[PDB]
């Protein structure tokens, strides 16, 4: 189904999900409750950001902060989400996540990061 903005990012992130374990992005909500999803994505673009293998699902309190802060530190990502907010709610809104990844994606492409595959 190409007719869907959310579908574009879904397959995009899911493509990287095949290169990870303990993570499965079914939807932009429940699948992000693990927190690791954020770090997995950031780690894929920034290998020198942190060690994903050293990250524990129980370290969710620091996981969100690590992902957000590092992304904002190396890619000046707009902090539309909060650590406390995400942990307290557990399940974030798909629109909030979409917008976060939206600007992030744009920022990565304009900096020649996502365009790592030409033809």
């Amino acid at each position: 189904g190409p007719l869907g903005s959310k579908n574009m990012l879904l397959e995009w992130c899911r493509a990287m999900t095949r290169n990870y374990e303990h993570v499965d992005i079914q939807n932009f909500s429940s699948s992000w409750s693990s927190g690791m999803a954020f770090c997995a994505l950031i780690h894929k673009f920034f290998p020198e950001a942190f060690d994903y293998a050293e990250l524990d699902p129980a370290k969710r309190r620091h996981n969100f902060t690590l992902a957000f802060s590092t992304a904002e530190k190396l890619a000046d990502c707009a902090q539309l989400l909060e650590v406390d907010d995400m942990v307290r709610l557990a399940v974030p809104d798909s629109k909030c996540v979409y917008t976060y990844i939206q600007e992030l994606y744009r920022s990565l492409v304009q900096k020649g990061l996502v365009k790592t595959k030409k033809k």
Partner: protein, 67 residues
């Protein structure tokens, strides 16, 4: 006028205002516009496409309603 917004709103499953250049062209041809592919590319070449990846449809809507 809202029909144009809704047309893009069907594609934009979140309501942000940003879509792909590929989907954008599909909406333009879906509306049954009387513009050729050449003209589409003309406007496209005068916009941001191969830069950030997300094309704001709002710009096209306004432009279309002006002409």
């Amino acid at each position: 006028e809202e029909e144009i917004r809704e047309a893009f709103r069907v594609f934009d499953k979140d309501g942000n205002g940003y879509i792909s250049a590929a989907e954008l062209r599909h909406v333009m041809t879906n509306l049954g516009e009387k513009l050729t592919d050449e003209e589409v590319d003309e406007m496209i070449r005068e916009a941001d496409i191969d830069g950030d990846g997300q094309v704001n449809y709002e710009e096209f809507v306004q432009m279309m309603t002006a002409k």
